[PDB]
Design an enzyme around this catalytic site. Structure first.
Site, mmCIF file in Angstrom:
data_model
loop_
_atom_site.group_PDB
_atom_site.id
_atom_site.type_symbol
_atom_site.label_atom_id
_atom_site.label_comp_id
_atom_site.label_asym_id
_atom_site.label_seq_id
_atom_site.Cartn_x
_atom_site.Cartn_y
_atom_site.Cartn_z
ATOM 1 N N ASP A 1 6.848 17.216 6.247
ATOM 2 C CA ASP A 1 6.643 16.443 4.899
ATOM 3 C C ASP A 1 5.129 16.540 4.672
ATOM 4 O O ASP A 1 4.715 15.407 4.068
ATOM 5 C CB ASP A 1 7.306 15.225 4.688
ATOM 6 C CG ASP A 1 7.638 14.772 3.380
ATOM 7 O OD1 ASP A 1 7.537 15.672 2.580
ATOM 8 O OD2 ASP A 1 7.990 13.820 3.272
ATOM 9 N N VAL B 1 4.978 -0.001 3.449
ATOM 10 C CA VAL B 1 3.803 -0.269 4.116
ATOM 11 C C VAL B 1 2.753 -1.070 3.363
ATOM 12 O O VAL B 1 2.932 -1.435 2.295
ATOM 13 C CB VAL B 1 3.013 1.197 4.230
ATOM 14 C CG1 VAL B 1 2.091 1.045 5.165
ATOM 15 C CG2 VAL B 1 4.215 2.288 4.851
ATOM 16 N N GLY C 1 11.447 1.898 4.462
ATOM 17 C CA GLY C 1 10.215 1.464 5.131
ATOM 18 C C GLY C 1 9.380 0.961 4.019
ATOM 19 O O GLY C 1 9.489 1.692 2.873
ATOM 20 N N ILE D 1 0.705 -1.250 -0.026
ATOM 21 C CA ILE D 1 0.095 -0.016 0.026
ATOM 22 C C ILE D 1 1.006 1.213 -0.002
ATOM 23 O O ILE D 1 0.243 2.395 -0.130
ATOM 24 C CB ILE D 1 -1.030 0.198 1.017
ATOM 25 C CG1 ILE D 1 -0.563 -0.071 2.459
ATOM 26 C CG2 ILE D 1 -2.267 -0.981 0.956
ATOM 27 C CD1 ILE D 1 -1.190 0.602 3.534
ATOM 28 N N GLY D 2 2.218 1.098 0.139
ATOM 29 C CA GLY D 2 3.046 2.478 0.387
ATOM 30 C C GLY D 2 4.541 1.805 0.507
ATOM 31 O O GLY D 2 4.816 0.846 0.871
ATOM 32 N N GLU D 3 5.501 2.920 0.317
ATOM 33 C CA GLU D 3 6.906 2.821 0.438
ATOM 34 C C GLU D 3 7.611 4.299 0.677
ATOM 35 O O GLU D 3 6.865 5.267 0.488
ATOM 36 C CB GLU D 3 7.424 2.363 -0.938
ATOM 37 C CG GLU D 3 8.437 1.396 -0.828
ATOM 38 C CD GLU D 3 9.009 0.662 -1.970
ATOM 39 O OE1 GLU D 3 8.536 0.754 -3.046
ATOM 40 O OE2 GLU D 3 10.146 0.039 -1.966
ATOM 41 N N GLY D 4 8.819 4.093 1.162
ATOM 42 C CA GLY D 4 9.758 5.248 1.483
ATOM 43 C C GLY D 4 11.190 4.506 1.064
ATOM 44 O O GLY D 4 11.292 3.764 0.653
ATOM 45 N N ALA D 5 11.974 5.470 1.552
ATOM 46 C CA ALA D 5 13.406 5.096 1.483
ATOM 47 C C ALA D 5 14.020 3.828 2.236
ATOM 48 O O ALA D 5 14.733 3.406 1.869
ATOM 49 C CB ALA D 5 14.404 6.378 1.529
ATOM 50 N N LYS E 1 3.496 -0.825 8.979
ATOM 51 C CA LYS E 1 4.545 -0.256 8.171
ATOM 52 C C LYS E 1 5.968 -0.871 8.908
ATOM 53 O O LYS E 1 6.284 -0.703 9.974
ATOM 54 C CB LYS E 1 4.807 1.378 8.587
ATOM 55 C CG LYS E 1 6.112 2.154 8.149
ATOM 56 C CD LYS E 1 5.606 3.528 7.907
ATOM 57 C CE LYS E 1 6.707 4.269 8.636
ATOM 58 N NZ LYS E 1 6.211 5.893 8.373
HETATM 59 C C1 LIG Z 1 7.439 3.723 4.557
HETATM 60 O O1 LIG Z 1 6.473 4.862 5.019
HETATM 61 C C2 LIG Z 1 7.011 6.157 4.445
HETATM 62 C C3 LIG Z 1 6.081 7.242 4.997
HETATM 63 N N1 LIG Z 1 4.398 6.633 4.580
HETATM 64 C C4 LIG Z 1 4.396 6.355 3.277
HETATM 65 C C5 LIG Z 1 2.652 6.414 2.847
HETATM 66 C C6 LIG Z 1 2.062 5.781 4.156
HETATM 67 N N2 LIG Z 1 0.606 5.238 4.302
HETATM 68 C C7 LIG Z 1 0.078 5.049 5.349
HETATM 69 C C8 LIG Z 1 -1.144 4.523 5.463
HETATM 70 C C9 LIG Z 1 -1.443 4.274 6.694
HETATM 71 C C10 LIG Z 1 -2.907 3.748 6.822
HETATM 72 N N3 LIG Z 1 -3.666 3.385 5.805
HETATM 73 C C11 LIG Z 1 -3.062 3.744 4.661
HETATM 74 N N4 LIG Z 1 -3.790 3.478 3.649
HETATM 75 C C12 LIG Z 1 -3.353 3.514 2.147
HETATM 76 C C13 LIG Z 1 -3.292 5.054 1.721
HETATM 77 C C14 LIG Z 1 -3.063 4.896 -0.018
HETATM 78 O O2 LIG Z 1 -3.907 4.039 -0.658
HETATM 79 C C15 LIG Z 1 -3.834 2.623 -0.201
HETATM 80 C C16 LIG Z 1 -4.225 2.658 1.134
HETATM 81 N N5 LIG Z 1 -1.800 4.278 4.254
HETATM 82 C C17 LIG Z 1 1.382 5.305 6.251
HETATM 83 C C18 LIG Z 1 2.397 5.672 5.144
HETATM 84 C C19 LIG Z 1 3.687 6.392 5.573
HETATM 85 O O3 LIG Z 1 3.921 6.501 6.859
#
Ligand SMILES: COCCN1CCc2[nH]c(-c3ccnc(NC4CCOCC4)n3)cc2C1=O
EC number: 2.7.11.24
Length: 348
Positions: A139, A29, A27, A21-25, A44
């Site tokens: 950010d 998700v 980490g 559902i997500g990514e970073g440098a 995460k």
């Molecule tokens: C490695 O981390 C880098 C920073 N970072 C990246 C983005 C992010 N998203 C979430 C999150 C939490 C709860 N629910 C959802 N839901 C999604 C929303 C988008 O569409 C699909 C579901 N996302 C947390 C973080 C976060 O901390």
């Protein structure tokens, strides 16, 4: 142990049926099913232990989220890690799962003026609580603004968050920065370390503009291009705003530019609510000392149908000082992360 995009997610047995559902440098998700609360959650995976910078950022994110409790701020439900420092390779933060983010939404959907107003209210309400805790998010951008089908909004990603430090904000011209380009305040490229609350307000202003047109307002193609886009719309800064810039490299750069006139908000956004553009102007103010503060923004006529200071809570326990983690080695930072996460462990 489930696997997502070539990354091991050691979160079982409580958490299963994972999906990216997500990514970073440092980490990743995932969404997952919580077998104890019988709901889907967001997990995460943070892998910071190979870099000191990432360890500092991990300890801050955890410390901040564990203190915060607010409807418009993503919280921590659980923290998963190995039982010993030796076995701890990663740290997993469990959060409420949200359906989408504002970045995904702006790519496909036109927002009604009521949606812009409501989403902006929630961003500022959550930001009031963060700033009241003496914290800067640093950010804010559409992918860090989570949403559900009922239009509830939550601010996420405190990976770059710091305790405010206005006395130590001064720096040189074009000094390196971490936070996202398009939402970077002009003072970042000029003379600021981004240690004041006005940094977050600029990003909110960029978000509001982006909600109004579905396009980033200042889309710098690279680091150096960003100030070109800002000055391209705002126009040349006034003599008074220049006299606030005392480092000669930044001042003389601005003085060397040909005169550029302000592009009026009503020409860039001809369908926008006049109150929304008045608030946008106050958030996108060149001089950070003249920039609107979060409590003033909430009280702006644009947000009059939501404004309720008694229902805009502040933090019970603000952070007094920042942690001095810059000289602390990654091994010592690993220990503090271990101690901060101890309370979530079985047999604690
Ligand atoms: C490695 O981390 C880098 C920073 N970072 C990246 C983005 C992010 N998203 C979430 C999150 C939490 C709860 N629910 C959802 N839901 C999604 C929303 C988008 O569409 C699909 C579901 N996302 C947390 C973080 C976060 O901390």
């Amino acid at each position: 142990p489930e696997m997502v995009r070539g990354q091991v997610f050691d979160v079982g047995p409580r958490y299963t049926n994972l999906s990216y559902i997500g990514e970073g440098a440092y980490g990743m998700v995932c969404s997952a099913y919580d077998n104890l609360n019988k709901v889907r959650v967001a997990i995460k995976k943070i892998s910071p232990f190979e870099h000191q910078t990432y360890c500092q950022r991990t300890l801050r994110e955890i410390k901040i989220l564990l203190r915060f409790r607010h409807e418009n701020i993503i919280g921590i439900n659980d923290i998963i890690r190995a039982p010993t420092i030796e076995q701890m390779k990663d740290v997993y933060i469990v959060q409420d799962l949200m359906e989408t983010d504002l970045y995904k939404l702006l790519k496909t959907q036109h927002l009604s003026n009521d949606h812009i107003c409501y989403f902006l209210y929630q961003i500022l309400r959550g930001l009031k609580y963060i700033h009241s805790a003496n914290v800067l998010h640093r950010d804010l951008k559409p992918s860090n603004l989570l949403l559900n089908t009922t239009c509830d909004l939550k601010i996420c990603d405190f990976g770059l968050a710091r305790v405010a430090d206005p006395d130590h904000d001064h720096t040189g011209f074009l000094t390196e920065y971490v936070a996202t380009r398009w939402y970077r305040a002009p003072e970042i490229m000029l003379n600021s370390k981004g240690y004041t609350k006005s940094i977050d307000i600029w990003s909110v202003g960029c978000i509001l503009a982006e909600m109004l047109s579905n396009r980033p307002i200042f889309p710098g193609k690279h680091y150096l291009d960003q100030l070109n886009h800002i000055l391209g719309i705002l126009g040349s800064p006034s003599q008074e705003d220049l006299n606030c810039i005392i480092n000669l490299k930044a001042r003389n750069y601005l003085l060397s530019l040909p005169h550029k006139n302000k592009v009026p908000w009503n020409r860039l956004f001809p369908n926008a609510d006049s109150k929304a553009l008045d608030l946008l102007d106050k958030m996108l103010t060149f001089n950070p000392h003249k920039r609107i503060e979060v409590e003033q923004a909430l009280a702006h006529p644009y947000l009059e149908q939501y404004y309720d200071p008694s229902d805009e809570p502040i933090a019970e326990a603000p952070f007094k000082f920042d942690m001095e983690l810059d000289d602390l080695p990654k091994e010592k930072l690993k220990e503090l992360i271990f101690e901060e996460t101890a309370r979530f462990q079985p047999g604690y």
